[PDB]
Amino acid sequence: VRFEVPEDMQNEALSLLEKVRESGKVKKGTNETTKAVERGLAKLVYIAEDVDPPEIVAHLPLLCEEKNVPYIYVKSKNDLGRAVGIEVPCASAAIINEGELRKELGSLVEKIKGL
Amino acid sequence: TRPNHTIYINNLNEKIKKDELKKSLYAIFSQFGQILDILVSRSLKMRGQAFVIFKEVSSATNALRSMQGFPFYDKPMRIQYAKTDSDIIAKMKGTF
Amino acid sequence: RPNHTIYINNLNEKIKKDELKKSLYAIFSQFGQILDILVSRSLKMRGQAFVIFKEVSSATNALRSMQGFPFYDKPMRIQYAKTDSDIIAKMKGTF
RNA sequence: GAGCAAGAGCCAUUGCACUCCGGUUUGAUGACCUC
Ligand SMILES: O=P([O-])(O)O
């Protein structure tokens, strides 16, 4: 984990996930997300902070940085699992299309660019 | 045991999803005359069974006679007439 | 000449392919394992199919039993597929 | 292992409907499926 993220910023990003499933396209789970990034389809990825073992998502920051993809941390992976609409935990996700919620996502990106 | 426009079928394969079940039933049974509807549920009380609503009783009879014990999804159909008229049939009669 | 695969024609052409595959399965699973089911995609070749079982006996029982069965209200013509005509069909888009 | 990306087991029920009603374990830390 590279930087700290305030709670409200997360909660916002999760709301934005659940919403963006309605108009955009989401890739859920770490293998799909890594693939999405490698193919440069990733608009922004989500990483959970309670992944055990950490080696599962540990390569996402480096890989996003190499492909110029913004990325945000969220506390719980059960939360992330709920946010993407599945019946199990989720460790990492990625928005690869949004349409409706462009400016919202946009605004979140610079907030992440803070640190 | 008294002839009805509707045949009641059971001993069906409970693993088959509902829409598929309706369409497969309609294949094997549209054979016998016009079908007004096919009714399927997978609730506790209604699983494994189906109702096929023929427009004509003759159709019903030939279906029942011709398909009795037929291995549908590898599992022998038990067919018998429905105990009472399906609502659409009653409406047609017209009682209801 | 007996095969583990039967060829069917006089199928009903106003039936979409997924439903067709499933219904075919519904009526043929009773004779044994089915490796695959292919329906025609061309227009030549408009109402045709291959059902590929695993065992030749399966295909033989199926052929005897279902000859002329009025599937979607049209009695099937069923025969043994010629050797490799199914994989050759799948390799092209004839299907 | 590669590909795919959300279902897959078990227990119970043989049950006559036309608005709808069992339980349980597992699966994005990757199920059925393809090679
Ligand atoms: O959608 P899939 O996982 O059944 O291929």
Q: How was this structure determined?
A: X-ray
Kindly give the distance from the C-alpha atom of residue C83 to the centroid of ligand 1, in angstroms, as a whole number: 32
The b-or-e profile of A10-25 (16+ CB within 10 A means b, else e) is: bebbbebbeebeeebe
Separation of alpha carbons A80 and A86, rounded Å: 9
- Within 8 A of C30 by CB-CB distance, chain B residues are 71-72, 74
The CATH number covering residue C59 comes to 3.30.70.330
Going by C-alpha positions, the residue among B56, B53, B58, B27 that lies closest to residue B40 is B53
The CATH number covering residue A110 comes to 3.30.1330.30
Whole-angstrom Cα Rg for chain B: 13
Torsion of CA A114, A71, A77, A32, to 10 degrees: 170
The H or E element that residue C6 is part of is strand C5-9
Separation of alpha carbons A56 and A34, rounded Å: 10
Separation of alpha carbons C39 and C11, rounded Å: 10
Taking CB atoms within 8 Å and a gap of at least 24, the contacts of A28-35 are: A28/A84, A28/A85, A28/A86, A28/A90, A28/A93, A29/A90, A29/A91, A29/A92, A29/A93, A30/A56, A30/A57, A30/A60, A30/A91, A30/A92, A32/A94, A33/A60, A33/A92, A33/A93, A33/A94, A34/A59, A34/A60, A34/A63, A34/A92
Q: Do A72 and A10 touch, CB atoms closer than 8 A? A: yes
d(CA C71, nearest CA chain B) in Å: 6
The b-or-e profile of C57-93 (16+ CB within 10 A means b, else e) is: ebbbebbeebeeebbbebebebebbeeeebeebeeee
Q: Which nucleotide across the nucleic acid strands is nearest to B7, CA versus C1'?
A: D16
Q: Does any strand D atom come closer than 7 Å to the Cβ of B83?
A: yes
Written as six digits, the tokens of B3 are 């002839």
Does residue B2 sit in helix, strand or coil? coil
Q: How many domains does chain A divide into?
A: 1
Separation of alpha carbons A95 and A108, rounded Å: 13
Separation of alpha carbons B36 and B33, rounded Å: 10
- Within 8 A of C23 by CB-CB distance, chain B residues are 23-24, 27-28
Separation of alpha carbons C85 and C1, rounded Å: 13
**Cα separation values, A102 from A71, A96, A106, A115, Å:** 16, 11, 6, 22
Q: Does any strand D atom come closer than 7 Å to the Cβ of B80?
A: yes
Chains sharing 3 or more CB pairs under 8 A with chain C? B
Q: Structural domain of residue B71, as residue ranges?
A: 1-96
Instruction: For CA atoms B50, B56, B57, B63, give the dihedral sign.
Output: negative
Instruction: For CA atoms B53, B57, B63, B65, give the dihedral sign.
Output: positive
Written as six digits, the tokens of A45 are 């990825």
Query: What backbone torsions phi and psi does residue A18 show, to the nearest 5 degrees?
Result: -55, -40
Query: What backbone torsions phi and psi does residue A94 show, to the nearest 5 degrees?
Result: -155, 130
Q: Does any strand D atom come closer than 7 Å to the Cβ of A51?
A: yes
Going by C-alpha positions, the residue among B8, B43, B29, B80 that lies closest to residue C26 is B29
Whole-angstrom Cα Rg for chain A: 13
Chains sharing 3 or more CB pairs under 8 A with chain A? none
Q: Do C48 and C86 touch, CB atoms closer than 8 A? A: no
Kindly give the distance from the C-alpha atom of residue A24 to the centroid of ligand 1, in angstroms, as a whole number: 20
Q: Does any strand D atom come closer than 7 Å to the Cβ of A89?
A: yes
Assign residue A71 a region (left: φ > 0; alpha: ψ between -120 and 50; beta: otherwise): beta
Which of B25, B32, B54, B73 would best serve as a mutation to test chain C binding (most C beta carbons within 10 A)? B73
Return the residue of C nearest to B74 by Cα: C30
- Tokens 């922004």 correspond to A44
**Cα separation values, A25 from A16, B71, B91, C55, C90, Å:** 12, 44, 48, 44, 33
Q: Do B40 and B22 touch, CB atoms closer than 8 A? A: yes
Out of B24, B30, B31, name the one closest to residue C26 (CB): B24
Written as six digits, the tokens of B17 are 């999803």
Which residues 51-70 on B are within 7 A of strand D at the CB atom?
Answer: 51, 53
Separation of alpha carbons B89 and B17, rounded Å: 27
Q: Structural domain of residue A74, as residue ranges?
A: 1-115
- Tokens 């009472």 correspond to B84
Which residues 24-43 on B are within 7 A of strand D at the CB atom?
Answer: 39, 41-43
Instruction: For CA atoms C24, C49, C35, C52, give the dihedral sign.
Output: positive
What resolution, expressed in A, was reported for this entry?
3.0
Written as six digits, the tokens of A101 are 């919620």
Written as six digits, the tokens of A31 are 């293998």
Q: How many domains does chain C divide into?
A: 1
